[PDB]
């Protein structure tokens, strides 16, 4: 519940980290460098960025945090309870586009 968290890490470094270890639905949590106090769910999709062989598309999801609650709707006591909940069914990253949390990036 803490080893998928990587703290102060940029979105581009997450992408590099997840694309190299290139298995779909590999995720990690990092704090947002755009909004302090919030966090970002960085997930490696199964969709290639371009043609065959190209790296897989990395998707970032804002997770807002105020009043000690966490939300991406419903809220959660901790980042763990958030990650645990969306691991079941996924996150609708865009209209009809879902990402899934299968493998944590340690």
């Amino acid at each position: 519940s803490e080893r998928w968290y990587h703290g102060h890490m940029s979105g581009g470094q997450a992408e590099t980290l997840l694309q190299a270890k290139g298995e779909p639905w590999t995720f990690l949590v990092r704090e947002s460098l755009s909004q302090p106090g919030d966090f970002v769910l960085s997930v490696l999709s199964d969709q290639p960025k371009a043609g065959p062989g190209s790296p897989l598309r990395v998707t970032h999801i804002k997770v807002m945090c105020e009043g000690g609650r966490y939300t991406v709707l419903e809220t959660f006591d901790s980042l763990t309870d958030l990650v645990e909940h969306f691991k079941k069914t996924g996150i609708e990253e865009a209209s009809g586009a879902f990402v899934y949390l299968r493998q944590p990036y340690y």
């Binding site: 102060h8 940029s10 979105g11 581009g12 992408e15 460098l33 755009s34 302090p36 960025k49 598309r57 990395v58 998707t59 970032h60 999801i61 804002k62 997770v63 991406v72 996150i91 609708e92 990253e93 865009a94 209209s95 586009a97 990402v99």
Partner: protein, 91 residues
């Protein structure tokens, strides 16, 4: 933080792509960060751009969809990015 990119326009668009241009803020910028995603949804894509560049091309969008395009100033000095400017464009 006030020193935020002062304008952000779509200079040319195809149904699946955009060519955005911003104007540099008053302060020297090391790099710009740009996010984009569908308005109302929590997912976004991200890519960085050297501080000498004021235009970027966003590709792979779905036609007739409102996307939210955001630019941040990046400084090696600062822990966090600068204040953002963001627009909404329909492909």
């Amino acid at each position: 933080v006030s020193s935020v990119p002062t304008k952000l326009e779509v200079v040319a668009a195809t149904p699946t792509s955009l060519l955005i241009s911003w104007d540099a803020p008053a302060v020297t910028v090391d790099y710009y960060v740009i996010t984009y995603g569908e308005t109302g949804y929590p997912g976004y894509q991200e890519f960085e751009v050297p501080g000498s560049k004021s235009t970027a091309t966003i590709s792979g969008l779905k036609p007739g969809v409102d996307y939210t395009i955001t630019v941040y100033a990046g400084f090696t000095d600062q822990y966090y990015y600068g204040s953002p400017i963001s627009i909404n464009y329909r492909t």
